Design a protein around this nucleic acid. Structure first.
Ligand SMILES: [Zn+2]
Ligand SMILES: [Zn+2]
Lengths: 114, 62, 899
RNA sequence: AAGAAGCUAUUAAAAUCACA
RNA sequence: GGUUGUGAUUUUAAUAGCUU
């Protein structure tokens, strides 16, 4: 038991290191005071993919203007849109007012464009 | 009377729950709202009619 | 009359109107007068001043004080000395003939109707009715037209979140008033005047107008004392969200007008100290931006309250764990190195980085969050941090199973007939596909609240007395009682196995090493929020925290002794550990009713208690419980333990449904000390209502010399002194125990207060609780849910969700609890999931319900009595299908008999 | 006498309910 | 995947003790 649990913890920690996006963090981390940045904002400044969960079409309108989104002083392009059920929903449907018939809390998978 | 219908609703959801009706959020939300509001219902015939609506919905999916 | 007016009219262009002629208006007004005969903050009647409405401005008033002819030269000289500054209203001085002698007249121009005191007081001491002054002030300030008050629940903070918008408008008035007070104090210092400044001296326009009690002295040698000025409005200063004009960042996060590097700023030390000097230059007591510098635990309360006030101006993202890149395992990864508490300020881990050492990394969020894509969620006002690689996923609730046979039997017995006053009223309500997050949105009620430090230091001292009986201290790992196989361990560790796996994984030496480490650093952790299958009487969903393993392991090891001392003690004012069986309930109610003269019972409950808990008072409770580590730990160790407790329980990153978040505040049910901390909170609120009401007693009218002396001493201890005299604290503790007796369980309790002392406002009646909850808990206690009982014989209307009845036997009169019949029937009918194969489980369920239902046997209502016997018959039937321990009623009878 | 059970608690674990 | 507290019951086991 002791060996199995510590080994699993090692594996999970190494997985986190694998998905850490190490370079992006340091490029911005060491600018701040003594290289200290609140953990609450490190992903928004260093992450590559951004997900957002809208409440209705009006939030869609506010957040993006031409298929891109501005957040944390950066511009984000909308790649794919998922509804509640996780089924693909294309931009044509959401743009049209007919989205009233669609499940409201759309989630958008956005990616950083520099 | 109220209890008779009020309990009767619970079994209906259980039947639906077995049918993974939650796969689509809209229907599941509709059913949940109807059930929750009938439970708090105090006057029978309204509870009866919402129960009829539930039953009609369930019969659609068999 | 016009002759008298002519003197005023000449300079004012005669554009004035009188109220009932030259006669002084009979109007009650708030005051803060400290005097040999009186020391009060309540309102009085003064009829020594005439009020003239200036018809030019929509609100300006002309007020003239026709008294103190001998004081004219004093007043004239003071006004001349102070008029040069811009914070003093215009005055006119003259004498007018009347009868056989002349009297002096001091006319104040363009003064507003209500003094700043009249606001600060009115906002406190709030109530549903008799709220005329607050309405009038809101209209005059233009916060909202009178039509806004058609919404009869307009004032409710939880039913009208728009109210906070209305109050935010007053924020400008408060900030302007403080700035004018700073200028006025500076002017008094320069001109050489000495005296105290009180809110009665200032108008909503922010100009001081009354100098009667001031004294002249050497130029520049003056000394103003404003302790009661600043401190008194502090609850108002926090409610109306003043200082919003000082917001550091003035743009939205997703608004285009924003800077990326802007977020990285976290220090804000200079910002906070500069704000403190700008607004609180005359607070005398030092301010520490970073509480880690504080010396006395009381000083931490003051400095942290101030930090809470300034917390508004800082970006919400600045708070949270402070991490940095570091060399770990040969792979440079981001490590936690400090935490930025909202109240305590910046704290940095003392030591810089074995399973004892390696284990924390897998639980510390620093590694996990940085490795995940960012998340923005509009469902909840609360902030959002990141989302896992797998993407978000929602979770739903299924309804409970309906036990048809039991229902049929109930029908057979004749229940649920068309006869009223009995029916099912609790059901396993089902919730939407993602009700978890939408429930977490309810934390938006956790608005920052600033409790006035001068009046709360005394209350902290008093409440500490209620907890001097018990004993605490640290205990080695081997001595901790552990409910092994705890059903969860938090998101980081719940994958591998239950908490036991880790308990036997970690040998006691490593646990002690980890504890010693925690006495030097900060180790934040997630808390996997999750849903709860549970019967309920209302549609609202329920969720629970479930704090991670490492927090509980160390947290209990720091508080266990104190909590155990709390449960084991009996007869105290906190009844967590007492049983309601074996007559224990009657013992509790008999102790509570003991001693009180003309006893009367009242009760209450805090709406949205778990969420609305002001994230400050939780810190206070965290200090009281830990205050007994006098010798085991030094001050620094105690402070790190406290800050770690806050990090794990108040501002921890809350995981749910694959989407991380950052909890604004409020308690988390998963904590070990939730019940105990809430009990301390409740004691604090109950006491503070007493201090609040006591100060407003109108001393001049009182005759109970004890009470007059008591309030004079209390006031002189709150504002006019530095260190609170233990003598007064013990005297007041005794006085409370003699007329205001409390029995508190977690976050609910009953009070047996003397009716006479309450009627004359000498102890906290319900209205006092309304006020205190309003301006400190920041929520409104709907009058429906509370209650009073003017006869002890009937006992409390309800305590701990159970009624109480009095029965006279050979043993005499004694009280018995009895749950609501409908709740018991419902619990019998519905079950959370499909019953397991063994029907024996049903036997335990039904026997336990019968035990909890036995008292109804004695109940007066014939139908209620049927409930117990029917359940008995059902258990008989169930067993027969499958004894005296269950068959016989006497077995339940002994459960409710003494010894 | 052993032994045997019955009873009695104390301890431990599980299971289950009520309460916050 | 379904929390932590504090009571309570039932079973089970151990522990001894008592009685027959
Ligand atoms: Zn300090
Ligand atoms: Zn200690």
């Amino acid at each position: 038991r002791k060996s199995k649990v510590v080994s699993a913890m090692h594996s999970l920690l190494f997985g986190m290191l694998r998905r850490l996006d190490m370079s992006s963090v340091d490029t911005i981390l060491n600018l701040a005071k003594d290289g200290v940045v609140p953990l609450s904002v490190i992903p928004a400044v260093s992450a590559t993919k951004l997900n957002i969960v809208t409440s209705d079409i009006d939030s869609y309108n506010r957040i993006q203007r031409e298929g891109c989104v501005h957040y944390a002083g950066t511009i984000w392009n909308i790649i794919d849109i998922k509804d509640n059920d996780g089924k693909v929903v294309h931009v044509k449907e959401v743009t049209a007012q007919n989205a009233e018939s669609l499940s409201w809390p759309l989630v958008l998978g956005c990616e950083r464009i520099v | 009377k109220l209890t008779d219908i009020k309990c009767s609703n619970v079994v209906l959801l259980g039947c639906l729950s077995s049918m993974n009706v939650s796969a689509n959020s809209t229907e599941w939300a509709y059913c949940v709202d109807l059930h929750n509001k009938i439970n708090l219902c105090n006057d029978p015939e309204k509870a009866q009619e919402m129960l009829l609506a539930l039953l009609a919905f369930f019969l659609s999916k068999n | 009359d016009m002759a008298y007016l002519n003197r005023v009219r000449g300079s004012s262009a005669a554009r004035l109107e009188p109220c009932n002629g030259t006669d002084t208006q009979h109007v009650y007004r708030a005051f803060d007068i400290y005097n040999k005969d009186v020391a009060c903050l309540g309102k009085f009647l003064k009829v020594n001043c005439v009020r003239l409405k200036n018809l030019d401005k929509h609100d300006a008033f002309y007020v003239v004080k026709r008294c103190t002819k001998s004081a004219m030269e004093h007043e004239q000289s003071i006004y001349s000395r102070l008029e040069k500054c811009g914070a003093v209203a215009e005055h006119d001085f003259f004498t007018w003939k009347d009868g056989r002698a002349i009297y002096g007249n001091v006319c104040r121009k363009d003064l507003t109707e209500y003094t700043m005191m009249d606001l600060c007081y009115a906002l406190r001491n709030f109530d549903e009715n008799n709220c005329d002054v607050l309405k009038s002030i809101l209209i005059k300030v233009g916060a909202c037209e009178e039509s806004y008050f058609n919404n009869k629940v307009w004032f409710d903070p939880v039913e009208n979140e728009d109210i906070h918008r209305v109050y935010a408008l007053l924020g400008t008035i408060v900030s302007r008033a403080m700035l004018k007070c700073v200028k006025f104090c500076d002017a008094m210092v320069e001109q050489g005047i000495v005296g105290v400044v009180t809110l009665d001296n200032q108008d909503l326009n922010g100009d001081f107008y009354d100098f009667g009690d001031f004294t002249c002295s050497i130029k520049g040698m003056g000394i103003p004392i404003c302790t009661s000025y600043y401190s008194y409005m502090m609850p108002v200063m926090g409610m109306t969200n003043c200082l919003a004009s000082e917001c550091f960042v003035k743009s939205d996060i997703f608004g285009e007008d924003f800077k990326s590097y802007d977020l990285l700023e976290y220090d804000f030390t200079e910002h906070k100290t500069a704000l403190f000097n700008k607004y609180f230059k005359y607070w005398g007591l030092q301010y520490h931006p970073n509480c880690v510098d504080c010396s006395d635990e009381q000083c931490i309360v003051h400095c942290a309250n101030f930090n809470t006030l300034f917390s508004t101006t800082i970006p919400i993202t600045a708070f949270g764990p402070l991490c940095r890149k570091c060399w770990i395992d040969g792979v440079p990864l981001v490590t936690t190195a400090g935490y930025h508490f909202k109240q305590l300020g910046i704290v940095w881990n003392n030591d810089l980085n074995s399973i004892n050492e390696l284990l924390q990394f897998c639980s510390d969020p620093a590694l996990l969050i940085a490795s995940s894509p960012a998340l923005v969620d509009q469902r909840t006002v609360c902030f959002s941090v990141a989302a896992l690689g797998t993407g978000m996923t929602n979770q739903t609730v299924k309804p409970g199973h309906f036990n048809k046979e039991f229902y049929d039997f109930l029908l057979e017995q004749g229940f649920f007939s068309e006869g009223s006053e009995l029916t099912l009223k609790h059901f396993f309500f089902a919730q939407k596909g993602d009700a978890a997050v939408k429930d977490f949105d309810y934390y938006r009620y956790n608005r920052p609240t600033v409790l006035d430090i001068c009046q709360a230091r005394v209350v902290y001292q008093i409440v500490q007395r209620y907890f001097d009986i018990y004993e605490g201290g640290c205990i080695t790992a081997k001595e901790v009682v552990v409910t092994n196989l705890n059903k969860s361990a938090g998101y980081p560790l719940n994958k591998f196995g239950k908490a036991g796996l880790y308990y036997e994984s970690l040998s006691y030496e490593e646990q002690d090493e980890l504890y010693a480490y925690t006495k030097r650093n900060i180790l934040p952790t997630m808390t996997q929020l999750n849903l709860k299958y549970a019967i309920s009487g209302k549609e609202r969903a329920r969720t629970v925290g479930g704090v991670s393993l490492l927090s509980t392991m160390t947290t209990r090891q720091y508080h266990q002794k104190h909590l155990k001392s709390i449960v084991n003690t009996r007869g105290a004012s906190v009844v967590i550990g007492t049983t309601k069986f074996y007559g224990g309930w009657d013992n509790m109610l008999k102790n509570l009713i003991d001693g009180v003269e003309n006893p009367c019972l009242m009760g209450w409950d805090y709406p949205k208690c778990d969420r609305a808990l002001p994230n400050m008072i939780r810190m206070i409770s965290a200090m009281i419980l830990g205050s007994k580590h006098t010798t085991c730990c030094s001050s620094t160790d105690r402070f790190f333990r406290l800050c770690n407790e806050l990090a794990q329980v108040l501002t921890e990153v809350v995981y749910s449904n694959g989407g991380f978040y950052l909890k604004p505040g409020g308690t988390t049910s998963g904590d070990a000390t939730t019940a105990y901390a809430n009990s301390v909170f409740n004691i604090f609120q109950a006491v503070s209502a007493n201090v609040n009401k006591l100060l407003s007693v109108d001393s001049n009218v009182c005759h109970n010399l004890e009470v007059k002396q008591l309030q004079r001493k209390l006031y002189e201890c709150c504002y006019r002194s530095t260190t609170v005299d233990d003598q007064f604290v013990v005297e007041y503790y005794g006085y409370l125990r003699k007329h205001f007796s409390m029995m508190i369980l977690s976050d609910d309790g009953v009070v047996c207060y003397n009716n006479d002392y309450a009627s004359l406002g000498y102890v906290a009646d319900l209205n006092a609780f309304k006020a205190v909850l309003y301006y400190q808990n920041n929520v409104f206690m709907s009058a429906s849910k509370c209650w009073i009982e003017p006869d002890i014989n009937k006992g409390p209307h309800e305590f701990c969700s159970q009624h109480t009845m009095q029965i006279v036997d050979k043993d005499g009169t004694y009280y018995l609890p009895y749950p609501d019949p409908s709740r018991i029937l419902s619990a019998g009918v519905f079950v959370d999931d499909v019953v397991k194969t063994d029907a024996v489980v049903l036997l335990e369920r039904y026997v336990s319900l019968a035990i909890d239902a036995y008292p109804l046997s004695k109940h007066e209502n014939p139908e209620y009595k049927k409930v117990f016997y029917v359940l008995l018959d059902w258990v008989k039937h169930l067993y027969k299908t499958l004894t005296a321990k269950f068959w016989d009623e006497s077995f339940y009878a002994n459960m409710y008999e003494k010894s």
